[PDB]
Amino acid sequence: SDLDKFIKFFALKTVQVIVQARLGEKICTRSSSSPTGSDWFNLAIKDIPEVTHEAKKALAGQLPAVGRSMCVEISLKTSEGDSMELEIWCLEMNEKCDKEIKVSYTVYNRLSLLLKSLLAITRVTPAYRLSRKQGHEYVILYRIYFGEVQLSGLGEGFQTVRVGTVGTPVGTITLSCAYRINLAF
Amino acid sequence: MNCRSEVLEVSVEGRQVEEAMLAVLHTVLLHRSTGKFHYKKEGTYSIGTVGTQDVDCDFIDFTYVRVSSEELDRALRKVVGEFKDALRNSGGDGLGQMSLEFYQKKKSRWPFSDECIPWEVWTVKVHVVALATEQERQICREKVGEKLCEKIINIVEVMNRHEYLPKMPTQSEVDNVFDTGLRDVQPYLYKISFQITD
């Protein structure tokens, strides 16, 4: 199934974009008029090998489904050792909640657009500027899990932003971020 | 097909006008571009890869992502700069707006009079305010940053609500849908204009 393939690599690239947005370094990739080998969704998104490993390890050959979501947790750890959850990115899927769809490039392009939205949004949540200022009194960490969404740990009044949704013949994909707005000990 | 319009409003110091406009315009163009199409005689097509680049704002506490096209960035910087100049020189209340319009060239099978039919318009309204102290300037850098975060979130949210995109073109009609004139990237056909209202 070409579609299962699309969803797998969309998940993998989602993790890459989020983790790379939290590295503390500006990201810059080049365009190519010619199709680049093993870039997906017509976006230049380089793969950090260690991140691919953790992502595949968490997925364990599964794709998102009801009650089974891919979550990327972004946290802050102080130099004293105290840890604080900053963000939970959630990639979810609906069940036999589909659309009688068109040719393959259409759904592919919609996933592409969702990754572009993710690129934009990862730069405008509070953790972005925190991640750019990391390295001394704190560091930014990530963790990936696959299962039930738990939004505890984000403190009172945490906000949620919907990055977007993509309908497919097998269900609706949804990508969102829940994020802490008050840093507190 | 019905054309969709969106309006954003920002209040900024004069020295922030350009970066604020570029942040919005590039966020929209990031979504409204693709890789360059290369057609075969049978009508099949391959698609190039779009790079992206983080851009730090120097006058706003903000970072935006843009497509990695020097040509596109040069074009946007030129018109945004002309807009900023016009706004500064107009001697009014510091009110102006820029519009980014995506359009298709009419196909013979379409019953329209105009040669350019818009399907999306994005308007960014600006109000320029003058500050008195460095103290206020520093605060303004922070606050405008927070507002732009809200604006980008709003752009993404409305993007998801816009269901329509042009039909993918055959080789003979690609220039009715896309700007094929750049080296790196392939935007939907667009025009940028501005107004000075007061």
Swiss-Prot record, chain A:
Organism in which the protein naturally occurs: Homo sapiens (Human)
Location of region: Important for interaction with ATG101: 117-124
Gene assigned in the entry: ATG13
Protein purpose: Autophagy factor required for autophagosome formation and mitophagy. Target of the TOR kinase signaling pathway that regulates autophagy through the control of the phosphorylation status of ATG13 and ULK1, and the regulation of the ATG13-ULK1-RB1CC1 complex. Through its regulation of ULK1 activity, plays a role in the regulation of the kinase activity of mTORC1 and cell proliferation.
Reported modifications of this chain: Phosphorylated by ULK1, ULK2 and mTOR. Phosphorylation status depends on nutrient-rich conditions; dephosphorylated during starvation or following treatment with rapamycin.
UniProt domain comment: The LIR motif (LC3-interacting region) is required for the interaction with the ATG8 family proteins GABARAP, GABARAPL, GABARAPL2, and MAP1LC3A.
Family to which the UniProt record says this protein belongs: Belongs to the ATG13 family. Metazoan subfamily.
Consequence when changing residue 121 to D: Decreases interaction with ATG101
Name this protein carries in UniProt: Autophagy-related protein 13
Signal peptide: none
Protein localization: Cytoplasm, Cytosol; Preautophagosomal structure
Subunit-structure text: Part of a complex consisting of ATG13, ULK1 and RB1CC1. Interacts with ATG101. Interacts with ULK1 (via C-terminus); this interaction is increased in the absence of TMEM39A. Interacts with ULK2 (via C-terminus). Interacts (via the LIR motif) with GABARAP, GABARAPL, GABARAPL2. Interacts (via the LIR motif) with MAP1LC3A, MAP1LC3B and MAP1LC3C. Interacts with TAB2 and TAB3. Interacts with C9orf72. Interacts with RB1CC1; this interaction is increased in the absence of TMEM39A.
Coverage span on the entire protein: 12 to 195 of 517
From Swiss-Prot, chain B:
Main location: cytoplasm
Location within or outside the cell: Cytoplasm; Preautophagosomal structure
InterPro entries for the chain: ATG101
GO BP field: autophagosome assembly; negative regulation of cell population proliferation; positive regulation of autophagy
Gene Ontology molecular function: any one: identical protein binding
This protein's UniProt keywords: Autophagy, Cytoplasm
Name of the protein: Autophagy-related protein 101
Organism this protein belongs to: Homo sapiens
